[PDB]
Structure formats: C-alpha cells, structure tokens
Amino acid sequence: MQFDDTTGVNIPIITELVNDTNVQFLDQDDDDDPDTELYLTQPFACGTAFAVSVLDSLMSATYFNDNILTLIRTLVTGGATP
C-alpha cells in the first residue's frame, strides 16, 4: 500500500504462521536460501513472524526445568495470579 501526507514496507506487523517453511515467503529483501533454518531467516530474527511450532519446543524445555514455564507465564501473561 502507498500513503500520502509513503509506503507500507515500514509498517510493523506480526504474522502467525503454522508452517515454518512459509516464513521466507513473508520477506523479499532476504538473501536467504531454501535450506535456511527457521531461526536464521530474517522474518524470525526481526520478530515480524511468529511460528507456533516454537511452543512445541517449550514442552521439552519444561521437561528439563519446570521453573522456565512459570517464569515465561509471569513475564508474558501480564501477571495472572492463581
């Protein structure tokens, strides 16, 4: 989109994506290649794409340390007390 008092490329957006392989479709200035992993792509590194699959890793992170989930919840949800 174009705007007059100039373009939508500087508008900050966050897009929820189900597949990690679609993250590289969100950006055009990237010099990425097809074999780039999710965390090394520009949309992920810039925070303009949220991949839900990262929550699947959180389960494993919860297995090795149960305090991590409590810290994340108290930092993220806004302070929801029991």
């Binding site: 679609n22 479709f25 097809p34 074999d35």
Partner: protein, 355 residues
C-alpha cells in the same frame, strides 16, 4: 538375516558331512560315503533351491532322515521369513527421482490442478503435429499420483512428457524438477471447485513459492476470479513486462460472449485464430471448404519497417493488405507520459513512429 542364512547353511552342511562320512552305527560304519564338506555345502544349496541334480546325495539312513528334516524345516523357515524379505524390499516409488537436463533442450514445468482433461487439452495444443519443430520437454509436478487414464496419456507422450510426484511449495521438489533452469512455469487452476477464492489464493501462493525460489523464471498462471489477480501485483518479483501473465477464465470467457453478443461468431473466430488447426483439403462444394480456408490464419507480431514511419495507420494497413497480403489489426503505441498501449485500428490522424 544374511548371517542367519549363512550360519544355518554351514551348520546343516556340517551335520550332513558328519553323518555321511561316519556311516550308520548299527551296520558297523560300512555305509560311509567319502564326501568333502564343500560337496555337502553344494548339496545343501542344490537341495534348498529345489533343483536336485542327484550327482551328490545322502546315502546313509540317518543322512536321508536328516535331509528329509532339512527339506521340511527349510520350507517352514523360508515361509516364515517371507514378510521380512517383503518389508526390506519395500515398495518402489514410481514417480520419485529428479529430472535430468539435456543440453540444447529446454523444458517447461507444469503444476497446479493436474488431471486428465486439463492435461489432455494442453498437450493437444502444445504437442500439435502441425507445430514447427520445438525442442521443449514438459515436466509435470503434482503430489497426487496419476490414475490409469493419466498414466496412459503420459505413456503416449513418453518421449516428450515426464511426471514427478511432489509439491510446488516444497523447495526440494522445485530443485528436483530443475526449476532454476526451466524456461517457464505454467500453473493450471481447478475450474470446478466449491470456493474459487480459495483456489485463487492457493495458486497465488504457488506463484509466491516459485518466485521465492527463483525470481527470474517466467510464470503463466490461471486465475478464476478477476478481483484476485490484483494480489499478483503485491509480489515484487512479478514482472508483467518480462513475460509473467495471468489468464483470467471468467473475464476472458464472459468478454468473448459479450463481444459475440455485439457480433455473432466472433468467439469462434478468435478461438480459431490462436489455436493450432490441421488443414483438411475439401473438393466438394460444401460450407466446410470455405470455413477451412479461413481456419488456417494465425496471429503474429512484427516490427514495422523504417519505410512506414510518418505514415498514417490506414495507409500502412492498405499497403500491407494489397502489396504484402497481410492484415494488420493493431499497433503498439509508446509515449513518454504513459506506458505502451495497444491501439486497435487507429484513425488516420495517428502516424507510425520508429520501432
């Protein structure tokens, strides 16, 4: 499994060798047969294949009993290990593998809604017998495996058409069909779907995937609804000036019908004008010969000669019809203020420019 087979073969040969060379005990070991161990290995192999030459065999009573037991047990053991052999053999992937490029030969990747009717029509026009010799192969990419009719159709064109199972959205499959060296990618649409907008969005996403893999490849896609092709302008790699095209089925079909409402038969004329039709010689006085006289015409584009500059369009059109026997329909007019525009039969006020 190989170790088990070899070990049981060797130990059965050992038992046979011992019992044959020792002889029967109740007959004072007078039944002994001087067989080497390797002759017994050979005997076991000849037996278990059910070949049984009879050049060597067990002569002693206990050796023959051992051979009967070995035949029965080997039959049971071979029957028990059939499922594991089948599992390790597995199923051959009919349409796996990658396309192999041939030097001095282009190829086109075709994807989208690949079924019998769309492929049949596209191949009927593309691989026409009257078409001039073009060394272009066709590579279909589709995740759904073809049925018997598509398999037969692909077999009929086995020297020009290849099929591969895979998805456009997967970059590995794009690398398989060599999309980085393909001349073009053609995307066909599902004309019979419940939601045309979903089909159009899926095709636009296929275009996005292909252009993300290789931004310079030429793409010709089919669009169902007219309002969806504006999405193609949101892709910065989409270049209409470099050959990227969207064919909107609804817009073109209903425009053909409307122009035929203004002048009947125009849809037939246009459809015959860009389709390859084989010419048939008719000598009988029928309407078919008059029809087929005009069926053979086609559209062409050419740069006007420098001798036509400064002349009006009607003058050049009359010169082309009378002298060169060519019907010039339209020109491409360029200007600094706007882009190039196609002018259909411009008036005598207009003059031909350079190039």
């Amino acid at each position: 499994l190989l170790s088990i087979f070899i070990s049981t073969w060797l130990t059965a040969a050992g038992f046979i060798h011992l019992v044959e060379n020792s002889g029967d005990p109740w007959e004072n070991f007078q039944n002994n047969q001087a067989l080497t161990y390797w002759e017994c290995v050979y005997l076991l192999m000849v037996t278990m294949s059910t070949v049984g030459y009879g050049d060597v065999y067990a002569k002693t009573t206990l050796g023959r009993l051992f051979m009967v037991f070995f035949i029965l047990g080997g039959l049971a053991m071979a029957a028990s290990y059939v499922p594991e052999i089948i599992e390790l053999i597995g199923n051959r992937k009919k349409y796996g593998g990658s396309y192999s490029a041939v030097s001095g030969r282009k190829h086109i990747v075709v994807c989208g809604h690949i079924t019998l009717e769309s492929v049949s029509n596209f191949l009927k026009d593309f691989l026409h017998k009257d078409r001039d010799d073009v060394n272009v192969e066709i590579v279909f990419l589709h995740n759904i495996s073809p049925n018997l009719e598509l398999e037969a159709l692909f077999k009929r064109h086995f020297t020009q058409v290849e099929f591969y199972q895979g998805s456009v959205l997967n970059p590995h499959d794009l690398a398989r069909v060599k999309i980085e060296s393909a001349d073009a990618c053609l995307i066909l649409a599902n004309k019979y779907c419940a939601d045309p907008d979903a089909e159009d969005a899926s095709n636009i996403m296929r275009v996005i995937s292909i252009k993300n893999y290789h931004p310079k490849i030429r793409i010709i896609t089919q669009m169902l609804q007219y309002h969806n092709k504006a999405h193609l302008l949101n892709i910065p790699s989409w270049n209409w000036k470099e050959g990227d095209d969207a064919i909107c089925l609804a817009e073109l079909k209903l425009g053909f019908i409307a122009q035929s409402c203004l002048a009947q038969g125009l849809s037939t004329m246009l459809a015959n004008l860009f389709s390859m039709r084989s010419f048939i010689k008719i000598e009988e006085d029928t309407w078919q010969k008059y029809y087929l006289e005009g069926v053979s015409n086609e559209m062409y584009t050419e740069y006007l000669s420098s001798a036509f500059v400064g002349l009006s369009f009607p003058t050049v059109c009359e010169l082309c019809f009378v002298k060169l026997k060519l019907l010039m329909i339209a020109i491409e007019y360029k200007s600094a203020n706007r882009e190039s525009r196609i002018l259909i039969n411009p008036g005598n006020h207009l003059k031909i420019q350079e190039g």
